Amino acid sequence: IRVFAIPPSFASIFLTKSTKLTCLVTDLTTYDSVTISWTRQNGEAVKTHTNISESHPNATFSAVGEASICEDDWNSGERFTCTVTHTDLPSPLKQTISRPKGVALHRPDVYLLPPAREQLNLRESATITCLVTGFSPADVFVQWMQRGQPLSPEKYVTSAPMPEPQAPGRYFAHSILTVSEEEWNTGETYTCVVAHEALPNRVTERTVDKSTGKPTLYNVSLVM
Amino acid sequence: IRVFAIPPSFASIFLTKSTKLTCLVTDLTTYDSVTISWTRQNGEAVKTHTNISESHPNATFSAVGEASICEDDWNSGERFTCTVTHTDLPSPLKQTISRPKGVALHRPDVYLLPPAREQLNLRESATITCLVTGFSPADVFVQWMQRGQPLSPEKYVTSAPMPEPQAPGRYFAHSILTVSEEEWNTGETYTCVVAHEALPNRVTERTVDKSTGKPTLYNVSLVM
Amino acid sequence: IRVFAIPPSFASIFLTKSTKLTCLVTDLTTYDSVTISWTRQNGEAVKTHTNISESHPNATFSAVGEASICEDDWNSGERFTCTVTHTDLPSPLKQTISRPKGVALHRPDVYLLPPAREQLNLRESATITCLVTGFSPADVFVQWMQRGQPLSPEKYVTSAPMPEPQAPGRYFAHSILTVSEEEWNTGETYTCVVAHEALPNRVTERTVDKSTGKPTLYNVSLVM
Amino acid sequence: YIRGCQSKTYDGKIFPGKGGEKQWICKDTIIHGDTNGACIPPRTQNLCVGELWDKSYGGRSNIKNDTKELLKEKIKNAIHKETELLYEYHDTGTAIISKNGLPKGFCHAVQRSFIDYKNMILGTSVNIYEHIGKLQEDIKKIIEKNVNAWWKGIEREMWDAVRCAI
Numbered sequence: 140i141r142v143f144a145i146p147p148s149f150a151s152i153f154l155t156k157s158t159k160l161t162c163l164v165t166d167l168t169t170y171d172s173v174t175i176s177w178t179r180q181n182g183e184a185v186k187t188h189t190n191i192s193e194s195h196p197n198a199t200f201s202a203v204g205e206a207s208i209c210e211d212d213w214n215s216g217e218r219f220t221c222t223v224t225h226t227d228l229p230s231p232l233k234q235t236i237s238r239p240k241g242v243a244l245h246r247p248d249v250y251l252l253p254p255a256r257e258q259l260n261l262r263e264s265a266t267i268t269c270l271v272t273g274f275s276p277a278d279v280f281v282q283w284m285q286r287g288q289p290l291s292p293e294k295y296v297t298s299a300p301m302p303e304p305q306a307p308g309r310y311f312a313h314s315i316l317t318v319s320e321e322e323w324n325t326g327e328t329y330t331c332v333v334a335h336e337a338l339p340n341r342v343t344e345r346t347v348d349k350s351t352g353k354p355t356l357y358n359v360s361l362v363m
Numbered sequence: 364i365r366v367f368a369i370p371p372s373f374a375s376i377f378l379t380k381s382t383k384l385t386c387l388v389t390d391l392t393t394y395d396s397v398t399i400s401w402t403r404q405n406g407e408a409v410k411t412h413t414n415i416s417e418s419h420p421n422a423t424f425s426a427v428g429e430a431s432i433c434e435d436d437w438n439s440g441e442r443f444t445c446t447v448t449h450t451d452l453p454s455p456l457k458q459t460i461s462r463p464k465g466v467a468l469h470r471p472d473v474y475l476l477p478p479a480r481e482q483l484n485l486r487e488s489a490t491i492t493c494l495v496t497g498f499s500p501a502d503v504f505v506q507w508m509q510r511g512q513p514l515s516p517e518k519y520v521t522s523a524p525m526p527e528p529q530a531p532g533r534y535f536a537h538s539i540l541t542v543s544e545e546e547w548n549t550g551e552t553y554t555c556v557v558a559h560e561a562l563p564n565r566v567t568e569r570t571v572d573k574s575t576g577k578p579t580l581y582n583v584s585l586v587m
Numbered sequence: 588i589r590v591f592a593i594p595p596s597f598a599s600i601f602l603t604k605s606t607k608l609t610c611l612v613t614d615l616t617t618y619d620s621v622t623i624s625w626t627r628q629n630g631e632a633v634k635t636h637t638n639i640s641e642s643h644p645n646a647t648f649s650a651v652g653e654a655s656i657c658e659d660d661w662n663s664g665e666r667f668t669c670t671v672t673h674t675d676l677p678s679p680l681k682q683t684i685s686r687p688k689g690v691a692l693h694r695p696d697v698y699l700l701p702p703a704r705e706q707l708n709l710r711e712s713a714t715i716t717c718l719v720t721g722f723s724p725a726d727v728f729v730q731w732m733q734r735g736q737p738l739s740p741e742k743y744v745t746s747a748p749m750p751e752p753q754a755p756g757r758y759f760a761h762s763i764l765t766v767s768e769e770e771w772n773t774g775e776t777y778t779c780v781v782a783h784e785a786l787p788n789r790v791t792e793r794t795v796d797k798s799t800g801k802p803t804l805y806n807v808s809l810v811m
Numbered sequence: 812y813i814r815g816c817q818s819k820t821y822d823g824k825i826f827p828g829k830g831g832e833k834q835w836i837c838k839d840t841i842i843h844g845d846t847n848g849a850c851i852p853p854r855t856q857n858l859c860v861g862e863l864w865d866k867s868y869g870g871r872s873n874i875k876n877d878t879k880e881l882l883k884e885k886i887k888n889a890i891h892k893e894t895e896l897l898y899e900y901h902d903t904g905t906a907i908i909s910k911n912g913l914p915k916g917f918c919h920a921v922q923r924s925f926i927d928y929k930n931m932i933l934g935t936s937v938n939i940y941e942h943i944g945k946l947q948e949d950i951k952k953i954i955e956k957n958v959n960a961w962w963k964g965i966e967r968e969m970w971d972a973v974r975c976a977i
């Protein structure tokens with residue numbers, strides 16, 4: 140008889156530019172007219188909930204309650220309580236979430252590794268991988284862009300952050316973009332904006348043309 | 364108390380060169396007379412569990428059973444059942460273990476991407492990344508060998524398999540090996556070994572060093 | 588009548604992924620009703636043997652008995668006894684075969700020598716040879732993969748292992764793959780995989796490409 | 812579904828792509844076709860050969876030893892993928908033609924791609940491109956081991972492929 144309170148992951152804040160509090164209940168006995176409320180440290184009701192789900196057929200409720208809070212309030216790191224009013228429980232079931240403290244911020248290092256030369260030989264597809272290393276906490280949001288315009292989230296995926304083998308307190312995330320080999324062999328940028336808390340401006344980007352590794356001082360060519 | 368299934372994975376059997384079936388009974392109190400046996404449908408199987416795990420911080424055991432089975436017998440698709448008989452359980456419970464079926468096999472395409480130029484310029488470390496793309500099912504074991512010798516598991520970390528961006532059924536995994544720039548500049552070929560079901564030889568090896576990217580025919584060098 | 592049971596050669600182990608055995612025999616009475624059987628020191632149940640060879644007209648009847656044996660059990664070297672009973676000879680033909688022990692494992696060195704320029708100049712063929720030298724166990728299995736797809740045994744011929752001239756314990760072998768010079772010039776990266784016990788993962792690759800082995804003809808030294 | 816054909820760029824890379832326009836190949840091959848005034852369209856140069864042809868290290872036909880039924884399936888998948896890629900190319904309004912509710916000129920493009928496939932299997936290509944010649948020879952070998960009769964039999968299924976894609 141607990142409640143799963145999902146904090147807004149930094150990807151959520153960066154995507155929509157707002158802090159969204161969503162608390163999901165679980166393991167609650169079936170009955171109607173069940174209400175939920177969001178309350179911060181002082182206990183004052185913050186915002187009425189929307190998009191409430193119907194009674195869960197699986198006998199375990201999962202109701203989504205959305206509450207909006209000031210960004211700076213969440214950045215400060217207070218404990219925000221999601222009070223669940225359940226008929227069986229004499230007092231409403233309360234679950235609260237606060238962002239982890241400490242978590243020494245370390246700026247990510249964004250290195251793009253262009254496609255392997257033995258992959259372009261297939262002349263079918265290529266995977267520009269935007270390695271991200273040496274950051275904390277384990278919350279990044281890698282977004283790709285071609286020629287400066289965003290690419291649909293279908294084309295790229297971001298591996299979950301994992302502990303870095305070298306530095307214990309740092310993590311590394313690894314994202315790839317599936318590019319067509321023609322679009323790579325023709326000069327195309329394919330930047331990689333990396334969003335993280337530790338960054339100064341909260342976002343950094345690095346581009347990879349076909350010509351990044353080229354010397355830029357001697358266009359040495361081989362011709363029969 | 365509840366019996367859970369831990370089928371062997373290609374990461375496990377290939378590393379140990381033997382199929383190790385594991386049973387799991389999560390969070391059972393510290394009691395005596397733990398009995399575990401293994402049986403197929405016919406039931407003639409008899410293996411003895413060894414080295415049961417010690418009490419965890421929760422002060423409750425987690426039953427673990429070690430069994431030896433031929434690779435062919437496991438690969439036959441036969442469902443493996445482990446007998447559980449213990450004092451806390453009111454009645455013995457049998458857990459069912461079998462591999463997923465009806466999944467196509469596609470050979471990986473191990474592409475070995477050398478570290479980005481920007482990272483070497485920092486003269487801090489280099490992360491040679493092994494891109495294992497276009498494979499299925501999502502069970503791959505990546506080993507890093509330097510000069511034909513295995514490297515310690517601490518040095519490299521392998522990303523968990525993730526769905527491929529574009530291809531529906533295929534997956535992709537990344538394995539990064541962190542080494543000093545001096546070692547990379549010297550060149551030891553840092554071979555990446557990938558073990559997967561779909562590989563015709565069941566193992567494929569790739570090689571990279573400082574000299575892979577440099578063109579072979581011309582050695583144009585700019586001097587001051 | 589004594590059965591010449593053959594152990595499963597490493598080529599059979601790795602090509603078929605299963606341990607298949609036979610009990611070829613020099614025979615006096617051409618035909619008898621009873622068939623082959625296999626026994627172990629543990630006395631476990633005999634495996635099913637089918638497709639026995641027909642009567643040999645010259646009275647030197649040879650019979651085949653197929654059995655499935657665990658690789659680990661055969662790896663341990665435990666002796667397996669072929670038990671063949673016939674009407675003419677009531678005494679079973681008890682003969683035992685085990686993989687020889689006491690031989691040091693030496694890692695093969697695989698060196699893919701490109702075709703002689705005297706051959707490519709004819710523009711009619713290109714015999715790539717996979718020189719496997721230095722492996723102590725006689726067994727070896729060389730397989731050729733062109734452009735990532737394995738090739739049928741018809742295309743390439745693997746020389747039988749023979750003692751090395753200098754080192755007496757070590758052995759050597761050859762495996763020439765012949766491809767039309769049209770294919771060679773495309774640079775298809777013909778790869779040789781050698782299967783041997785001593786190898787860290789039982790298979791190591793060596794890839795030869797039209798570009799490999801080409802020195803730096805042009806060494807342009809632009810100095811300002 | 813997946814066949815190794817990338818999004819069409821014959822008349823220009825899809826947005827955000829900018830360049831990549833393929834010009835008309837107003838040239839003829841001395842060995843194959845000798846004198847032919849026909850100019851290969853950019854679309855035909857970018858025809859989704861699919862699994863019939865892999866560009867790895869030059870050009871190598873992927874149907875050296877393929878059964879008649881397998882070849883039909885390969886061509887059906889290639890036509891389906893060609894229809895899909897042409898639809899997404901013209902729907903974004905990148906084809907020079909495309910600059911009912913279908914994208915303007917998409918039906919023209921898909922019909923013409925089907926005609927190009929028909930002439931590829933038939934072997935009567937006006938001008939042989941790099942992928943056209945070897946594929947034509949191999950398809951002639953596979954069927955005759957009469958090509959016109961085969962296509963006159965499977966044309967309904969191949970066009971059903973385009974209809975199913977749509």
Ligand SMILES: *[C@@H]1O[C@H](CO)[C@@H](O)[C@H](O)[C@H]1NC(C)=O
Nearest residue numbers: 350353357358359360361362
């Ligand atoms: C030389 O410069 C041209 C710019 O038009 C470029 O296309 C070409 O690739 C360069 N040479 C080499 C060897 O890359």
Ligand SMILES: *[C@@H]1O[C@H](CO)[C@@H](O)[C@H](O)[C@H]1NC(C)=O
Nearest residue numbers: 577581582583584585803806
């Ligand atoms: C290739 O160029 C580099 C640049 O200085 C040089 O160090 C190297 O020796 C050259 N390769 C050979 C084989 O001389």
Ligand SMILES: *[C@@H]1O[C@H](CO)[C@@H](O)[C@H](O)[C@H]1NC(C)=O
Nearest residue numbers: 582584586803805806807808
């Ligand atoms: C290539 O040229 C560089 C230029 O200084 C020189 O140092 C090097 O020895 C040359 N190598 C060969 C193999 O000629």
